[PDB]
Structures are given as structure tokens and as C-alpha cells.
Amino acid sequence: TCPFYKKIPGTGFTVDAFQYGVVEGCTAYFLTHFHSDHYAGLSKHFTFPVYCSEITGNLLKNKLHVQEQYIHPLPLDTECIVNGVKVVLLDANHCPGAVMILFYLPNGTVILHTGDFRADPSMERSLLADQKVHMLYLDTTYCSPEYTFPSQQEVIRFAINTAFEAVTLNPHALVVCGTYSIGKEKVFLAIADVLGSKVGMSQEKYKTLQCLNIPEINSLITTDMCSSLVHLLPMMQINFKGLQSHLKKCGGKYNQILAFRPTGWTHSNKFTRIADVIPQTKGNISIYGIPYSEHSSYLEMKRFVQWLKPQKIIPTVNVGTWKSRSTMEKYFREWKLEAGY
Ligand code: NI
């Protein structure tokens, strides 16, 4: 059964609610983004209207085979009327196609649902600038001050400089990057660009990237592994065994692997600065864990909320324990007393 923090009061609408069968009273299901915890339930058999971005819609049609008659893509930054209710989709700065959704309720209440997001000051100059939000349904993934990590741009600078140095010292090195969902594509795209290569991958992953409206993509990626010196592998293969196994398949072209494992936050962010990060190494294989986050840091989150000044906050992540719920409520009250709303 559908939980309350996925329901939008006073509408026939749910958000990211596809795993509960038919939801009593729902005339339109919104999908914020193509991650499995959020789409869980969609297939070729779905016969209700799905409202989403153009990129999410491409992924539903090609990867999950949802029939085209039930896909309703909406443009971003544009007032749209759905079942007699004004809505707007906003870029969430998460993975490709991910949105926030602003709902203008018939009773005058305004609701923002962030989906999954990485708060940014640029959001302060979207269509949110105008106005009051009575209810914020907030991605609280990292809602505690211990959760610190660098900018995406700093992490990508470290990855480019690390890969360009290694391959200039050894032209016979291969670079390997792990993936398991959409998002974080800048990590392998920026590496391949500095090295003058296309990115090599499986047929399945190529098909997924072809859905994402990335400009000039045909110039950047390939299924011909032999032609590429940056390879993508599933994340589960990014270990000494799985990397050794890969190196054998490459026909003695290469005598070293440098591999990247993009993660979210890890506890080594408490101690070690991005500049100071070192790899795990066995023989001719080296693995770097890099904290490339597509969710708000605590500080980013706090800034966004203190700017927006919502009347009420409903968390959508870490809601399962009394201690988690309590911690988050303590922070929402501090932020409100500090800023005066
Ligand atoms: Ni997500």
C-alpha cells in the first residue's frame, strides 16, 4: 500500500508510486526519474497515464517497453495543465531526465516535490523565485552535518588529471570505469575526452546512453571495445578479480589497468581531502574510489531550504526509524529559528 509521503493532497496524483498495484483514486502517476527504487513496477503491461520528462519517457519506451500511448512527456520550465491542475517540471540536478515537480493545488496551496536532487544556488533563479511553497517534500538523503563531500567539478578535475598522468607515463595502460544505473556519466565522458578516445561498453549500456539526449553522443561512445581505451563495466566487476579477468580478454594490448569506482558519500570524507586520495593497488591494477554525489550535501540542502522558507517539510528519505525522523526534525527547527521564517 502507497505511503503518505508519495501522495499529493487534493489531486488524483501520486509521485514515484508504481510498486503498489492500482492506487485507489489515482488518475495520473508522475515519475521524477529513471532509477529503479522509483520506477519499481512499470512494464509493457501498464495502462495508466505516466507523466515525466522527455528523457525519462525515452527510457520507459526503449528499456521498459511501456506503450507509447501511455507516455506523457512534459517540457521543463513551462506551466502545463494536467487533469485540471497547473504543474511545472524543474531540473533536479540529479541524473539525466530527473525533475522536481511544482503543483498548484485548486485550493490555493503550492507544493514542491524535489524527487532526488542536488541542491544548487542556480535553483534560486528558476520559476521558484516568484513564490510561496506551503509544503516541501524533500530528498533528505544526506540530512546531517557529517555528510560532506567535494563539488562535482573538483572530483572530475581529479579524475581527468589522474588518468591523463597515468596514460602519458604508460601509453599501454587501459582505463576502466564502473556503472550500475544512469547518472554520473561526466566521470567516463571527461576521462575519454582528455585521452582522445571513445568510451567502449556493452550493447545494453550503449542502448541506455542513446536515450539521454546528450549532444554529439555518436562521437563519444561505441560498442567496439577494441577501438577504445576507456571501457565501462558493471560496478560489481570493479575489483582485483574482475579486472584481471577483463585484462586477459583484451588480447595483450594493455599491461596495466587504472579503474574508477564512483560512489556517494563514504566515511573517508571525514579525514581525507579529494587532492589527497590514493588508490588500492595489486600488481599492475589500481582502483580509485571517488565521491561523485548526485544528492545534496548537508550544507547545500540547508541553503536551499532556508532560501525557499517552506511552511512545512515532509522528508522522503531516512523515514524508517524513530531516531532518523527525530534527527531530521531537529535540523528543520534549527534552520527555521536561524533564518526567522
Ligand atoms: Ni535517484
Swiss-Prot record:
Upregulation: During mitosis. The mRNA encoding this protein contains an internal ribosome entry site (IRES) in its 5'-UTR. This 5'-UTR generally suppresses translation while specifically promoting expression during mitosis, when cap-dependent translation may be impaired.
Domain of life according to the entry: Eukaryota
Cellular location(s): Nucleus
Function: May be required for DNA interstrand cross-link repair. Also required for checkpoint mediated cell cycle arrest in early prophase in response to mitotic spindle poisons. Possesses beta-lactamase activity, catalyzing the hydrolysis of penicillin G and nitrocefin. Exhibits no activity towards other beta-lactam antibiotic classes including cephalosporins (cefotaxime) and carbapenems (imipenem).
Portion of the full-length sequence here: 700 to 1040 of 1040
Organism: Homo sapiens (Human)
Species lineage: Eukaryota, Metazoa, Chordata, Craniata, Vertebrata
Family statement: Belongs to the DNA repair metallo-beta-lactamase (DRMBL) family.
Assembly and interaction partners: Binds constitutively to TP53BP1. Binds CDC27, which is itself a component of the anaphase promoting complex (APC). Binds PIAS1.
Reported tissue expression: Expressed in brain, heart, kidney, liver, pancreas, placenta and skeletal muscle.
Protein name (record): DNA cross-link repair 1A protein
